[PDB]
Amino acid sequence: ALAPRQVLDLEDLVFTQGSHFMANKRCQLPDGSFRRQRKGYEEVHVPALKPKPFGSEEQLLPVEKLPKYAQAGFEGFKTLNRIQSKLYRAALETDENLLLCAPTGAGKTNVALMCMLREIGKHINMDGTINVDDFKIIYIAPMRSLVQEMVGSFGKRLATYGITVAELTGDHQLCKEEISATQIIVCTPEKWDIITRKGGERTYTQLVRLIILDEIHLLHDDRGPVLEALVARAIRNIECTQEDVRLIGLSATLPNYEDVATFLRVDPAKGLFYFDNSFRPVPLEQTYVGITEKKAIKRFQIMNEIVYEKIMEHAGKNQVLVFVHSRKETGKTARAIRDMCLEKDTLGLFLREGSASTEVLRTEAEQCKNLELKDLLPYGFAIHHAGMTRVDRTLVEDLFADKHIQVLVSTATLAWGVNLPAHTVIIKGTQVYSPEKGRWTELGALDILQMLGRAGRPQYDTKGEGILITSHGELQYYLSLLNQQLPIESQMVSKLPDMLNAEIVLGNVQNAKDAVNWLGYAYLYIRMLRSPTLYGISHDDLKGDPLLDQRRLDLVHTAALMLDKNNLVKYDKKTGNFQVTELGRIASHYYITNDTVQTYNQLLKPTLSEIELFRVFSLSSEFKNITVREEEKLELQKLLERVPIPVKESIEEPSAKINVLLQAFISQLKLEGFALMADMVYVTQSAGRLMRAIFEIVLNRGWAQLTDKTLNLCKMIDKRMWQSMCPLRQFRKLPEEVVKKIEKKNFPFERLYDLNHNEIGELIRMPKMGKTIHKYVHLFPKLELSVHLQPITRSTLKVELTITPDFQWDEKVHGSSEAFWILVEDVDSEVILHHEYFLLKAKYAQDEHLITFFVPVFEPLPPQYFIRVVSDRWLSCETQLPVSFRHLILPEKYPPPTELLDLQPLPVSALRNSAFESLYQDKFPFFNPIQTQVFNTVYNSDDNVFVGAPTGSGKTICAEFAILRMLLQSSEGRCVYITPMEALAEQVYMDWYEKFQDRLNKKVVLLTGETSTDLKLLGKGNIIISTPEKWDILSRRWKQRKNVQNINLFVVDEVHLIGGENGPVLEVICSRMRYISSQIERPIRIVALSSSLSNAKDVAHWLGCSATSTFNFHPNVRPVPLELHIQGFNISHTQTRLLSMAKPVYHAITKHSPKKPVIVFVPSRKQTRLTAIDILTTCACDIQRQRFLHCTEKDLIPYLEKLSDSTLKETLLNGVGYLHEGLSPMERRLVEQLFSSGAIQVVVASRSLCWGMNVAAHLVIIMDTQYYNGKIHAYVDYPIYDVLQMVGHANRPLQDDEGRCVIMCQGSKKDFFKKFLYEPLPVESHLDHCMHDHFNAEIVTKTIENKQDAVDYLTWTFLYRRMTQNPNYYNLQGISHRHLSDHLSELVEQTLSDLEQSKCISIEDEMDVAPLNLGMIAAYYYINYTTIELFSMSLNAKTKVRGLIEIISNAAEYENIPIRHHEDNLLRQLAQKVPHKLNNPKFNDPHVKTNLLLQAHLSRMQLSAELQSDTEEILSKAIRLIQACVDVLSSNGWLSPALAAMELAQMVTQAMWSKDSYLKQLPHFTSEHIKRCTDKGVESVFDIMEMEDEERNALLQLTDSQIADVARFCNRYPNIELSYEVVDKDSIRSGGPVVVLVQLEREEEVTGPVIAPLFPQKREEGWWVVIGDAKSNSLISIKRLTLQQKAKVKLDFVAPATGAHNYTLYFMSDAYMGCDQEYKFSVD
């Protein structure tokens, strides 16, 4: 939106007077106003307004009839106040926004409490749990001491509900260790503005339903813009999130109050309330006088004789306090009476309650003497201020509320601190010293009203008394303030650039027009409309622009020019768009002005000296008005010589006073002159934020030297000490004299670790507390650093810093966490090459943490690096560790990518077969340049080819070109297509099913879990799809399964996935094929579909690919040109970083893909809904509703009717769907189909779904790059290939002209993606860390016969080709061939030696090896060798059913069952629900998780999401693990544990327990249904079919249309007809063998699968024919054969001596339970 703009001078439109700028011309005096005069001061009185009788419409309303849920807290308050009674219905029965205008004395504390109780009254739970802390309340009080009043008052009056009210404010870093358990937050406007000032600090605002703006007439003060920024930001978020927050405004009666109502969106008919001074709690009789001229020395005198005769009205009935300004002036004016009133006349000769200066009874008794209270003690005089006895100043207040002290002398802090009123307030010359200007300007208006509001004590008085004294010229201002005639105005023109740059950083505004609308949400907009002539506007330019579209534009334009001048925000004149700079981000987050940032940027240098750092601080524009007075030259010089840092900036003047005041505050130098005490506080409270901003500015720029200086100065200000001092000063409970004595001699602090508590006393001449010093030395935080280095390229290294804590934890000392800064720098410690914020939580304190980051290197490789880990809070808490490269062997250079020639795109006409052109012509005519170049090799040849192109480059059909080659030279060819992901396996299978079996009539199959049906699917299959694990178990027995070698084509997609998790299983089978291709029959064509690989020559040479048949392309030759945009979020807290991205995610869609489809990848599945709804609310927030829905809602109602997720049905109506694993396949296919159709423009998918998605888009936004890992209690980055596949979804060659991906990640990971995505991806192997199972299986299959065969096996692996080029990655100390054979021999020796003591193999000679019993069962079931070793270790002769349940759950195959967020206590609930709870469960162990998942699966408990997608993974590997226990228990000779193990596979498929009911296989039978047949009913599945009378649904009925399913599992449920055969003549008297034969044929000729309603895998019926002893726990024979109709019962055994032996034939199953029967017999 372009429009001509004009520059404005803000100084002309600003209210220069600030808080005391009165807009009214005159001042209406009341009726009883008389003006009496003296010769130095003239009096102007106003009377005490009479009390108004209650009208007929309003009456007092007690607390009895208000609702019972909120009557608590009002205990002790019988009847509501007259104001509360008028708002009893508004503040408790309506959620309308309120604005209370009342006299300052009205209290207003109960009305704010009634609005809280209404918010609290929404979550009751019928007194079962009042603590439903889903809500939060904010109370914004203007002054600091007011906050201490509300926290205590609301504390006692709300603790009855379990509510916890706290207060976060001051100079801390927004501590979240005690906020999530808080419900009412009390803080200042600037503090709550600091909250919402950060990027993702919305956690508080998302739960807040109520905010209260107490003393909201602060809008008139210079702090007014802070309140405007709060409300304007909060209301816009109410619109941008569609969640309503109720605003309550509390104000003193002043003009323009209705404008404050419109500012808060208050309905003047149901929310606005105004009560003039007629509603004062006590009618105050005010006086107003003004000094004429001075007589400056007599000014202090003239103003004092007017204080005495005001005490003369009533002796004791006149209770007084004298308000001053200075802390010690509580004595000066209290000595003025002691000097003036003493020597002139009667110095308050008080003499009533007794005989020696009134009551001294309770005066001399309660006697503490706080070094000031005494000279005014035998009478009612007392002092109060923030100066001294801050601990026992409450005693000055305690002995006063009981009517004990009659005159006080206090400061403005008390009026806000504790509500202690009096009969007569008083004040003095209202001209305070303001360090912001260094002047003595008029007192702030907000103080004066709160000051005189203490004129009352309604519980102990009936009349007030006014009492002010000031000048005359420009002093009728105070008449208009205290008499409801001081108009509330807007000071936003003052702080406009600071409030604008705020919203720019939040993203709430993006350009000039975005900000002009933001200006309409503030109080400045309304005030510019009602009184436009006051705000520099005229009446003629108002008619042409009543909305002020030009003035607000001119205001935004000028403020934007200042932010550009100071480099806060880059902003152009033409488009008017805003761009946030790093300086603007820090200026906002740390609340520093735009002028200060420019000075910081103008001066900060990498080599900036420490003395200049204090200079750069002292030039902060927050101190631009701090000057120096003559009364300060003496004390300032007596500080400069006492402070350490040599101040070379100036001998004095202004910049050095700020510098000296810093070091004086750091060194805790006690000051005397009060002109410096008030100035030092101002240059130190901001010193925390100012120096912390300089720290982040320097840290993010990588200036290692100044980063250490600025970070130290941040701790030096916080800890109020220097680095030269002893670090033990930070322990604030050690005697300073002792700590000052340990630093007498220059004894190093680290040497204290090596000294006991006795040697401590030896060197400190004080063995008194030598033991309590050894306590705090070991309480100091100390970290240990160990590093493992791994080179990736010749320019990057993979550092694995292992942090080990070495100290004792203490929440009293450290708290709930300890922060650190992992800084890695170069040799000279000048450049921070990488940095990240490491946190050390309390509950995981002594646990070991491993941080994985990457660092760059260069060809002139320096000898070392340095990983310095310093603390973020503690001074001198640093652990350093060099990283020497003296043994570093950088990898080999990667060859350039294969050049892409601009060949004329070959059409489908080049493909000869017209039966194939029909599968490629109706889609696109010409192949892309990457395809047209590899065509001739992959199709017109029979050699091995390797294609390397980025994901999403049409590379999938290149594998199909090799498939067409096989079909032309084979009838029913044999092709095995391998894909590392199961989701991508089904994604290509169905894609290839149509293109080869539907239209080409060539059977295309997909492998499964059971190897029996896998072998027959291998036979029928012409195009075979398989994951590495399914093809490994089949191709392992390749010697026998000869249909594995006869394959003609062997495709492997995404072979760069060899270096990731589950990678070695892909390397083993790809080398398994390269080896069984040694001229056995014919080359098996090893086409390996890969991506951009730097070391692609190693993958080609591995798979026999030549150089001509190796096409590896750079990522930039992508067919659809990609525009990658990586932006960083410097937020270490992951839960906050995600919420800080929900706004840039929407702002990225509107910029990169406004009308084209967009995919967003979020880490968790709960974020799929949140990010979708956030896009919804932020979309309608832009007044752009339904711009992502490109169809009409009527066209979606039929489709959305079949959806069950109510939220998906609502978000899709707004054109934004989402995809997560919690959705049904029908729901996922629907959202993917509607997205590719263009109906919806946005899908928000999980990370886990980035593979199984047949969907592309124009813009792919990656929300986060980290997912939670509950096993280590830390967040880990995305696997690089997960990110790669996500970026690939930004590929639409037919539609889009370009691809666009936006990666949003933590700033610590930005430099990682900044080069591993623009460059080819280097790949390495991981076979050494997963070698035993493939070696153990190679020996059982007799492929490895000796140790030399194991060395020969490694010659075919990808590990062989990479160990020579990147040595240090696999810890190869040398590069020569001498080290290659040594490391290989050491590798095969250590791998076989592990199988030796694991009983898997048997080493006999230095060469030969042989498999054993444990080794064969581990290779048969594809079970890890440690699992069957654990089985042989734990299985004894008494393992029952529950004993087996615990053992199988501990299998190594269940190690990768993930532990996710908020499951540490979610799994704790299942332990109290399962019938067999475990002892010592930590709930963060996957084996403890898997044990509870099947214990709930056994009890048929619902799966409750999340922990349900892992249960299906358990049941996949569940069958093979139980059958292993059957073999181990049979090998050991135990029948009772073996029979219980055979029952386990039964109770898993149908989900039963040990003593469960047998009818639990019925398709519709609840848990309370077996009780229908317990008296004389059915108990088995046989008497329901033996009952030839087809009764069926005649004893009890539930469903008639679904009894067609019970009839299916009925005749599949097999009956038994068994009769063992033993002869007495073929064997007798033991000795020889004994042979037994069992039956084979059964009734129903069944050809139906096993019913698996709860088992996610189709199964086959398997039965164990076991012959064991009667009850001697001796399993004699056992055979596991598949169930059919005819087999050969091969079982035999040797008989024991004598002859009388009772045997038993067991015929157990593995699918159902009930058909098992026993047969007892005896032979011999």
Swiss-Prot record:
Location of the SEC63 domain: 580-885, 1411-1723
Protein's cellular compartments: Nucleus
EC number(s) reported in the record: 3.6.4.13
Name of the protein this chain belongs to: U5 small nuclear ribonucleoprotein 200 kDa helicase
Entire protein: shown range: 402 to 2125 of 2136
UniProt motif DEIH box: location: 214-217
Family: Belongs to the helicase family. SKI2 subfamily.
Organism: Homo sapiens
GO MF annotation: an example: RNA helicase activity
Subunit architecture: Component of a core complex containing at least PRPF8, SNRNP200, EFTUD2 and SNRNP40. Component of the U5 snRNP and U4/U6-U5 tri-snRNP complexes, building blocks of the spliceosome. Component of the U4/U6-U5 tri-snRNP complex composed of the U4, U6 and U5 snRNAs and at least PRPF3, PRPF4, PRPF6, PRPF8, PRPF31, SNRNP200, TXNL4A, SNRNP40, DDX23, CD2BP2, PPIH, SNU13, EFTUD2, SART1 and USP39. Component of precatalytic, catalytic and postcatalytic spliceosomal complexes. Component of the minor spliceosome, which splices U12-type introns.
Helicase ATP-binding domain mapped to chain residues: 89-272, 936-1111
Function noted in UniProt: Catalyzes the ATP-dependent unwinding of U4/U6 RNA duplices, an essential step in the assembly of a catalytically active spliceosome. Plays a role in pre-mRNA splicing as a core component of precatalytic, catalytic and postcatalytic spliceosomal complexes. As a component of the minor spliceosome, involved in the splicing of U12-type introns in pre-mRNAs. Involved in spliceosome assembly, activation and disassembly. Mediates changes in the dynamic network of RNA-RNA interactions in the spliceosome.
